[PDB]
Design a binder for this molecule. Structure first.
Ligand SMILES: Nc1ncnc2c1ncn2[C@@H]1O[C@H](COP(=O)(O)OP(=O)(O)O)[C@@H](O)[C@H]1O
Ligand SMILES: Nc1ncnc2c1ncn2[C@@H]1O[C@H](COP(=O)(O)OP(=O)(O)O)[C@@H](O)[C@H]1O
Ligand SMILES: [Mg+2]
Ligand SMILES: [Mg+2]
Lengths: 93, 372, 370
């Protein structure tokens, strides 16, 4: 399963994604095995799309926070007149 | 060679000394006593006021006043007397050659800090002064960089979470319930057995009773049941006039107000719930290290049952998979002063002082610019 | 006669459909006794609801059943609905269909339990649940625009095109008037005033409703407040004490534009509105920029329209016309829109009746209702 999206209105953003799904099915006459094939296709692609949506839900707290936080751990903006007060607190082991 | 002075001005005690030492040189009560009777013998000293231990020595003929109530200085002339007796009588130094470090409770009025800066710079005129939060100094003395500090003294019980040296200001909580309210509540409940204490000198006696005989129960209802069942929890105390009193269940009802503030009519939650609310107002990925590094500081954390009770209450409030460790050092009565000496003995703190020329240029409002 | 009830996080606005104004506006609080009762020649209840709580709050602990838009206590919400139906409206809920309101982007179990309680305990012939910002746009006489709904628990930015809300552009900020009241309680400690109790929280709420405003330029307002005492205002306490605040009048609503003042990660309401507009298609952005509609009591600060105009003009392209509509009755705008919707002719076949709830269960509200 592959998805590719490009969006370039004022800047640029791209998404590439793929997933490999392996399952098994029983074999019978043509109509029943066709229905089973459609059923496993549905139950794979629905979970893939729902997982993509839930991954977009938690981007700003799990993966984007690992690169740049939205606020520091003090939950406030930096007081630029007190840089040494931030630097002093890490010198005591 | 201009060594710095570390002075902790609590609501009940003054802990003052030199930077670099491991123990405060001067520990004395923050009281001013004035005579309430008339003097009939002439030819003596007979001074109009008494500061510190001399006020406590002749407290029977004096009325006692505290210049600091709930962390806020209310009387400034009495605080002038306290600081003058600190510098010139308890330390024997001239405060023109030593920069000074002072402590303050969080969420205090700004006028208190401005007036402290003003009285340090043009009454006891210092080359430099700094004002610091007490709980971050307790964590500096504890040897950690992350953790939540519960500082409880005579006026203010405050919880401050610090993560890697960063004090987190939106999770700092303050309660105006401390050892003086506990002393007043024990003074009230001592009238059930017939012991009546009224005057300000007898408040010191009730405080001594509280320091010697009170403790925190692990389970309050079982302790009340076993106190009513048997006379095995009673203890006896001797008054200055030789009379003996006995308390059986006032020993654990007095520090139960720290866990149930409704005993004195207050609507606020307990210290355990305040700690849990301070942790829950932090970031979700740092709550493990905050739960593992609970630090207790101050004189009201010196009851000999309080760590196990706080452990039980926090473990009840916390989720079941979390590890809760509560650290109570044996020297936690003086922990703000030790961390203050550690902070004042550092090389990178020497640029953080508020100098005299900066006070002359900016007036008494630079303390909101250079100090947290 | 239909019933329109707006159960907000801080106020309850209920009345009959067709009237132009709500008939019952009362605080959504439950008060319980705190002290020892010593007199026996008295009523001596155990729970006080609404204004009776506010007239007795000095001996009471107050509780809000709704926190941050979602319902935390359901017994207290039952008490609120009982007091609304039987004491403030004097109606019988067995005879009247009842319209209900709900904030967007909410858990579904809240709507499930709302329908279950309204059909099993306060049995109505029919009920319906509507979105508040859509009704606030309906009350303003338009069908296309973006609604900024800021109340007591939530702030929402909802864009509606041709009567349909756009769910992929609904933005939710968890900052409203309760957080502003608590931040004012925090910043009044600098001048020496201590407010701790739940009764004093209402006093600080009254101070915020009476004295605060929104600065046009925050840095210049802080510069002018630190130069002279031309901005200091006085307030008289219930016990006769007089307090004076100088720069807390505009620092408290600045949390709407700088949410980091209380330690929240999200952006201000101007950036939230610009993000809600910018998620839409280009051909409707002109209509959404021209039709900004304010709603709720937290938009009642007397500086918020000009400041919002300045900030959205700064964010938007320079060829775009920005118009912000702040109706003078926007404290009651969800109720008026619900009155308009419930008095429509074709709306009468969109009621969820009791028979369909019997045949479906507590899940019909996700199929027949939005
Ligand atoms: N062992 C003890 N048990 C109970 N209370 C104590 C004990 N030691 C001190 N206290 C209380 O601590 C209060 C002051 O503690 P401390 O924090 O050291 O001073 P301050 O509050 O002035 O900073 C006193 O009022 C006293 O009642
Ligand atoms: N004049 C005013 N200025 C600022 N805020 C106000 C004013 N009047 C009311 N508010 C705020 O509006 C909030 C509730 O408004 P409203 O939206 O009508 O109720 P709800 O939020 O319960 O739906 C209250 O928290 C109150 O603080
Ligand atoms: Mg202290
Ligand atoms: Mg509302």
């Amino acid at each position: 399963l592959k998805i590719q999206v490009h969006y370039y209105e004022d800047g640029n953003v791209q998404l590439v994604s793929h997933k490999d799904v392996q399952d098994s099915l029983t074999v019978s006459n043509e109509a029943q095995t066709a229905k089973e094939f459609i059923k496993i296709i549905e139950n794979a692609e629905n979970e893939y799309q729902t997982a993509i949506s839930e991954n977009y839900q938690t981007m700003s707290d799990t993966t984007f926070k690992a690169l740049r936080r939205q606020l520091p751990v003090t939950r406030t903006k930096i007081d630029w007149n007190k840089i040494l007060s931030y630097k002093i607190g890490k010198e005591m082991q | 060679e201009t060594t710095a002075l570390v002075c902790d001005n609590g609501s009940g005690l003054v802990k003052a000394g030199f930077a670099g030492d491991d123990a405060p040189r001067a520990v004395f009560p923050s009281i001013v006593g004035r005579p309430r009777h008339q003097g009939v013998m002439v030819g003596m000293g007979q001074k109009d006021s008494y500061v510190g231990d001399e006020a406590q020595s002749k407290r029977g003929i004096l009325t006692l006043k505290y210049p600091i109530e709930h962390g806020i200085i209310t009387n400034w002339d009495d605080m002038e007397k306290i600081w003058h007796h600190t510098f010139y009588n308890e330390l024997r130094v001239a405060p023109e050659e030593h920069p000074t470090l002072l402590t303050e409770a969080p969420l205090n009025p700004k006028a208190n800090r401005e007036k402290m800066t003003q009285i340090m710079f043009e009454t006891f005129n210092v080359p430099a002064m700094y004002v610091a939060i007490q709980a971050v100094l307790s964590l500096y003395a504890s040897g950690r960089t992350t953790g939540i500090v519960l500082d409880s003294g005579d006026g203010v019980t405050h919880n401050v979470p610090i993560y890697e040296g960063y004090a987190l200001p939106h999770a700092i909580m303050r309660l105006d319930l401390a050892g003086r309210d506990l002393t007043d509540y024990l003074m009230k409940i001592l009238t059930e057995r017939g012991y009546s204490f009224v005057t300000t000198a007898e408040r010191e006696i009730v405080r001594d009773i509280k320091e010697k005989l009170c403790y925190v129960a692990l389970d309050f209802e079982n302790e009340m049941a076993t106190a009513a069942s048997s006379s095995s929890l009673e203890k006896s105390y001797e008054l200055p006039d030789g009379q003996v009193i006995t308390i059986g269940n006032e020993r654990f009802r007095c520090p139960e107000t720290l866990f149930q503030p409704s005993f004195i009519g207050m609507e606020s939650a307990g210290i355990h719930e305040t700690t849990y609310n301070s942790i829950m107002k932090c970031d979700i990925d740092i709550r493990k290290d905050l739960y593992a590094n609970n630090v207790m500081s101050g004189g009201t954390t010196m009851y000999p049952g309080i760590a196990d009770r706080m452990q039980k209450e926090i473990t009840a409030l916390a989720p079941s998979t979390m590890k809760i460790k509560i650290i109570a050092p044996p020297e936690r009565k003086y922990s703000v002063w030790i961390g203050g000496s550690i902070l004042a003995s550092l090389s990178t703190f020497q640029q953080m002082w508020i100098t005299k020329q900066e006070y002359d240029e900016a007036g008494p409002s630079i303390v909101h610019r250079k100090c947290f």
